Design a protein around this nucleic acid. Structure first.
Ligand code: SF4
Length: 355
DNA sequence: GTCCACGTCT
DNA sequence: AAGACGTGGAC
């Protein structure tokens, strides 16, 4: 608001220029490359992302190349990062850019914001870093920093609250170098102004911070500690040939873990067991199996639910037509398919049990 | 174990 | 709105 913004900016950027970290997506400011990195970093920590970004870009060097890829290739590249919709949207958006915008990522916030997977944070991030457009790039990190600097006690969960912080950015932003400013802000929240025990002693902008002066940084920002989970018990069948082929299946185009492959499963609700599994299997494609007592139970967390998995090894005797989205996959071909992490562990637990 | 990441869409 | 949508880095 009021506020010595000009020198705040000089302190922040001075720090950022010096203390800046080595990240592959910083090695240049190609809008495609920048855009990929910001999609990968969504709800994902920087260290996690680094090898993904490197492999992805290596496999899909240009915007054009991502557009020409089969959806499944792109999914496999994303295997493990989570929030798999991001990659379906990125793929789609890049096709639109190739057709509608002739391969070049739009530097107008409205054109860009209309693309799939691109929300307000990503508009600011990508366009400021890659094009110097002075849009705010407000995310969790920035709101933490700003909530502390200006002692803003709004629930960081409310839709309206990001808009409040964006306005604060608009006011204090350094329009000379919006990209640098934006990233500095973000990287400060990321490395220094951390959720617990921020490193205020080392903070380039300590002198401007109200939270610090009032000794309340650690009770900011305010966010609902939001409860629940929903536990979801789930039986999983790892069924093999005499021939080494394994029965796997492809999840639906939408909903949870869209288009990923899995070992066949169903929700046991209680913990009755392989019975429903045996029924499944049978009820589908002929298929008579002999399931043989669970080899492991383990939990697997999603943001909005937990799978309680129990995995049943089993043997196959045949099944007229296995069709639909099911498949008999030779063991050595399992690596070609994209599995959610849950089922990669299912397979790991399984392959172990039968050394 | 907990928290929440360089959030978006509905 | 408020809830769906994955996973692990860093404590
Ligand atoms: S002083 Fe402490 S709280 Fe204020 S910005 Fe720097 S790190 Fe965050």
């Amino acid at each position: 608001e009021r506020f010595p913004a000009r020198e705040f900016q000089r302190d922040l950027l001075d720090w950022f220029a010096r203390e800046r970290r080595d990240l592959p997506w910083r090695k240049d400011r190609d809008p495609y490359k920048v855009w990929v990195s910001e999609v990968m970093l969504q709800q994902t920590r920087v260290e996690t992302v680094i090898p993904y970004f490197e492999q992805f870009i290596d496999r899909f060097p240009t915007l054009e190349a991502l557009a020409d890829a089969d959806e499944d290739e792109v999914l496999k590249a994303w295997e493990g990062l989570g929030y798999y919709s991001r990659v379906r949207n990125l793929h789609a958006a890049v096709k639109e850019v190739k057709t509608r915008y002739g391969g070049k990522v739009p530097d107008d916030p409205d054109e860009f914001s209309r693309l799939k997977g691109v929300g307000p944070y990503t508009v600011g991030a990508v366009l400021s870093l890659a094009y110097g457009v002075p849009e705010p790039a407000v995310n969790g990190n920035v709101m933490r920093v700003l909530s502390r600097l200006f002692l803003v006690t709004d629930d960081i969960a409310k839709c309206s609250t990001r808009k409040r912080f964006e306005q604060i950015v608009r006011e204090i932003m350094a329009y000379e170098n919006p990209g640098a400013f934006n990233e500095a802000l973000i990287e400060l929240g990321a490395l220094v102004c951390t959720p617990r025990r921020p490193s205020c002693l080392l903070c380039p902008v300590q002198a401007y911070c109200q939270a610090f002066a009032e000794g309340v940084a650690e009770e900011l920002p305010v966010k609902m500690k939001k409860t629940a989970v929903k536990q979801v018990p789930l039986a999983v069948a790892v069924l093999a040939d005499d021939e080494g082929r394994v029965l796997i299946r492809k999840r639906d185009s939408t909903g949870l873990l869209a288009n990923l492959w899995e070992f066949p499963s169903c929700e046991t609700d209680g913990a009755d067991g392989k019975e429903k599994l045996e029924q499944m299997v049978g009820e589908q494609y002929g298929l008579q199996v002999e399931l043989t007592e669970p080899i492991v139970s383990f939990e697997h967390a999603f943001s909005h639910l937990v799978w309680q998995l129990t995995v049943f090894p089993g043997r196959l005797v045949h099944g007229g037509p296995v069709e639909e989205p099911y498949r008999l996959a030779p063991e050595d071909e399992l690596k070609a398919y994209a599995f959610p992490v849950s089922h990669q562990r299912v397979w790991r637990e399984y392959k172990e049990w039968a050394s």
